[PDB]
RNA sequence: GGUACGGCGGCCAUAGCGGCGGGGCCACACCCGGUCUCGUUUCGACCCCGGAAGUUAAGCCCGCCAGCGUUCCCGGGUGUACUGCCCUCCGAGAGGGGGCGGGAAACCGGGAACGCCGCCGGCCA
RNA sequence: GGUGCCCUAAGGUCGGCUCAGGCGGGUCAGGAAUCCGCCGUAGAGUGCAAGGGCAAAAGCCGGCCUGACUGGACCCGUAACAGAGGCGGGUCCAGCCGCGAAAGCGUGGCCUAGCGAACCCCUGUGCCUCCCCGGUGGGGGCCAGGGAUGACAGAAAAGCUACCCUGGGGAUAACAGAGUCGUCUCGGGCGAGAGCCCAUAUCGACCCCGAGGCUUGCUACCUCGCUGUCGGCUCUUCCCAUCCUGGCCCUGCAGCAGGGGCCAAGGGUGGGGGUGUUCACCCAUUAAAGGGGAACGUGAGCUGGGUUUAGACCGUCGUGAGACAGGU
RNA sequence: GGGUAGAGCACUGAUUGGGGGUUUAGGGGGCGAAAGCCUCCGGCUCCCUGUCAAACUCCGAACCCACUGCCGCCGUAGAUGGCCGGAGUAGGGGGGCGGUGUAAGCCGUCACCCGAGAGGGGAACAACCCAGACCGGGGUUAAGGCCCCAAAGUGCCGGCUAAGUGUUACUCCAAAGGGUGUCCCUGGCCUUAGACAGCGGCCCGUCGAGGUCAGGGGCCCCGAAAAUGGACGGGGCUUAAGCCGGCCGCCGAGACCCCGGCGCACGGACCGAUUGGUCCGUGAUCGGGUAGGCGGGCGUGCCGAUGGGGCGGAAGCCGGGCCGUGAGGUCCGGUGGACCCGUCGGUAUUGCGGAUCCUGCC
RNA sequence: GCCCGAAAGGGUUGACCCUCCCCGAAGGAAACACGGGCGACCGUGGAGUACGAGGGGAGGUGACCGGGGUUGCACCGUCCGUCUUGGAUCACGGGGCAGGGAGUUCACCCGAGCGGCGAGGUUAAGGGGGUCAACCCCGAAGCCGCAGGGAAACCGACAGGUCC
């Protein structure tokens, strides 16, 4: 049967943890800062449900083009299209 | 070192990546030969096209013969001792010796075409086009034995 | 310069769990009371308040133990299982073989490991 | 495997605490449970499925509250890449507020299901407007909420045709062909054993390996105005997987006979009764009265009994018109 | 960044047997004076042994994806990209991968081919092998092949097969189980007398030289029955014209090399009544094509202009030549007896093989 | 191979054919002298010679050639149009010949190739003249544009300040 895409479809593994992390992350990640032009990996922490991008884009690398509130504005390319996301720094990781 | 690559097989019934890599190597047609410098970035592409080409390490005398008999300039004009002696200060044997053992690039000749277009081998390929040279066939890595084949194709 | 002293942290088990043995100006705890601050759907036990007669026994500090768990290394297992590309190779078929490239898991034997780093303070002399 | 809900708390926030089970202690029939200690990485619990997440909590126990609000902006998904009305979610700016010592959090439910265009209508709210001008009653417009289309991107909606018609279709059934062989038919391996005793004269379990495409099914490659017909009569030819006729072998072969096997397809294999029958059943003879293939051979060769076109009767079903892979 | 293959039992759930400890959640009885102090078939917690997972994971590839820098390729002869406009396409198939299904098939996926793709081979063959095609010539190779049909070997060396087995890369080939039929590699027990073969009650004289049991491989044999007359493509082939392990020369495409000719694309120079032309340069990186888009040319009837032809014979018709890729143009001869053509610019009932097309003739 | 010819095609101002000299792309021999290999064969030198598409020259000869009709031998070749994944099909249409026979016109909208005027552009109906359906002059009514936003009442802007 045909089934539409939703936020948590086929996310069993990708939004799961190994049972030796299991909880609140350390706080450096919560308190990261970023500059415009910095490349960032999109890596979702499944224990924090605010500022969560669609898991479809988990594993990609984008560029920061600004801030709004505590969230950063990240651009990616999907085909020819450019897409824009508001992501909490906990779901992000810098390149290098 | 300098590697000589000869194209042996058709691209009908090959994958598009293979076709594109051969085009990047300037090996568009059968029985065409290119000279390349040995590096990881070229070795990867060779490994990708391994089943459509032969390759090996070329020698200075064979390179000089090849420059004299099949070397061409823009316009498909042939290369001559006088042209060389003029635009540079060597003979062909000296230029090719250098090119082989470093110290000069082929491109250092103005208006030199990078593709050597050969004729098929005298007496035939002495192996099957469907197999590797090591197991008795024609395809893949030779060594100094690529020079024997070039001479038959020259 | 010293101190078997303490506060705020980082990396989050090579740091844990457990066992053994040692210590007390300063310090850190346990300890006695509860009128008052706060409170016990009953107990001043726990939280809070007031202070030290008194204790090194516990926590804490110090050193050790390879017992459990954890991470790393060398060698075997083994270039084994699996696998990307090509094949007028085999085989009735399934399924296998050859060339060029990648490459485990269990298990076995032998070694390292019973935390590392940052900031400011206190006390003795 | 679940939803088309439920909750003034199961919503917001602050504080404090830690679960299931097991063991050892006591009153108790299974005892549901109340009491004490230890161990104990979550085995518990969470408004609800499944998966994910969570331990000085996102769980338990309490206290104060109503951010389950107003005005607006930009993003993601449904619908990758690659277009979308409506729906859902995210990040913020202001306003007015809640919890809190404060930092902070709060735009319902720890995350992902719980619903819906145009046109018309009802309610709230304050403004614009109605044909020369000005009043009164009434009407129209802008904004917000609500009333439904589950065939859920949304017609207001029951049947028969055998008296049937048109346009088309092998994109799609009946039939011959083609494919396949579960099923079927015909075999085999081993040997449980049965046979006075003796595995294999004869019979051979349960498991395992195959041939054929003449039995039925499966599929949908060919053919929709090629011929669509079953059976019988007539006429020709082919196979052997042999009933009789010729020749042999073993036997639980005395003879007469039987049983089981090998070679062999040159010849034979008939006549009648009831039924449309093929088949099957029966009778008298007979050396025996074998079976299959050839578009289930053979309707530009015959027949037309059967095969529910148009007429008619019975039964049954149906309000009825009518129908019946039922009969006449 | 990711949990597939593989692997394993650390979670969830399945699953054999033993050796022990608590005994009982519980019906059976036994000495059961009665659920009894105590045991029997059974539950709980260990240890050793043996098995599993599409909806399990203490582990964990090959591979794929995004991004950074470099190598390579494309790009000022203007890419990537954006705007405007014109479409066609909504029945796909072969081959490889997955799920389902006895299977044939059904449903998806990759995007090499057929569709829309000539030529050389496989006997003929949509998609299996070689190889992508302007024209005229000369050469070398590919796939495969070399007894005759049929271009090129009755080719060479070592060995196997006796069944016409075979003479089949694929499209288009029957097993479980048996035979030591023959050629080979191994391992144990025998062997100065062993396996029988004879005279007699293990052996003396006997024969005297190798024998016997096990495992393994190569080729073949059995298992193996159908309908018109017949298929390694045919003839036929047996130290092969079959098979295995290797080798040596030849034949064979439109592919590759060379010479000449045509066109296209881009750039440039020059000459022009105006969508142009002659020439030069570059082209290993231009030269197949269905639906479909774009560019330039040929032909037909009438008008405004311009140049012309015709009784010393127009149009039309029959037969022949030359030019032109070509659609077509023009000349010669014959028949005929009154009108016709070229160029520039406009206009249109403007081009037929087919509609079970229409009218007429045969 | 048999047959026929016009002269529009060519040709005695030289058809065809024969021999010799020069240059020659890619490609490329053999005999022969030695040697390697059990052999089928190979290497060396002969030799990049002799040849070789083609590009030029010189002499002997003296009349055809190109073409056309029909036909023999060898090699190759399953008609045309159509839907269809797939056509020589036992899928549909298809005896022969000649003439006929299918993207037209108007109104509105979107674009383009060119041309005229230009902050303005353009006339309609109609009228006047003439050599009278052709030609010349007049005629801006209206339409688009020059300022928009807003349901409506209503309100009502940079003819240039900075940078790449």
Curated annotation (Swiss-Prot), chain A:
Quaternary data: Part of the 50S ribosomal subunit.
Alphabetized GO MF terms: structural constituent of ribosome
Gene Ontology BP annotations: translation
Protein name as annotated: Large ribosomal subunit protein eL21
InterPro entries: Ribosomal_eL21, Ribosomal_eL21_arc, Ribosomal_eL21_CS, Ribosomal_eL21_sf, Translation_prot_SH3-like_sf
Species whose genome carries this gene: Thermococcus kodakarensis (strain ATCC BAA-918 / JCM 12380 / KOD1) (Pyrococcus kodakaraensis (strain KOD1))
Domain of life: Archaea
A GO cellular-component term linked to this record: cytosolic large ribosomal subunit
Family as reported in the entry's similarity comment: Belongs to the eukaryotic ribosomal protein eL21 family.
Bias kind Basic residues: ranges: 1-23
Keyword vocabulary terms for this entry: Ribonucleoprotein, Ribosomal protein
Region of interest (Disordered), ranges: 1-26
UniProtKB/Swiss-Prot annotation, chain B:
Gene3D superfamilies: 1.10.15.30, Ribosomal protein L30, ferredoxin-like fold domain
CDD domains, A to Z: Ribosomal_L7_archeal_euk
GO molecular function, one term: structural constituent of ribosome
GO biological process, one term: translation
SUPFAM superfamilies, per the entry: Ribosomal protein L30p/L7e
Pfam families: Ribosomal_L30 (PF00327)
Cellular component, GO annotation: cytosolic large ribosomal subunit
Presence of keyword Ribosomal protein: yes
Keywords assigned by UniProt, alphabetized: Ribonucleoprotein, Ribosomal protein
Xref: HAMAP family: Ribosomal_uL30_A
Family affiliation: Belongs to the universal ribosomal protein uL30 family.
Subunit structure of this chain's protein: Part of the 50S ribosomal subunit.
Protein name, UniProt field: Large ribosomal subunit protein uL30
Species in which this protein is naturally found: Thermococcus kodakarensis (strain ATCC BAA-918 / JCM 12380 / KOD1) (Pyrococcus kodakaraensis (strain KOD1))
Gene designation per UniProt: rpl30
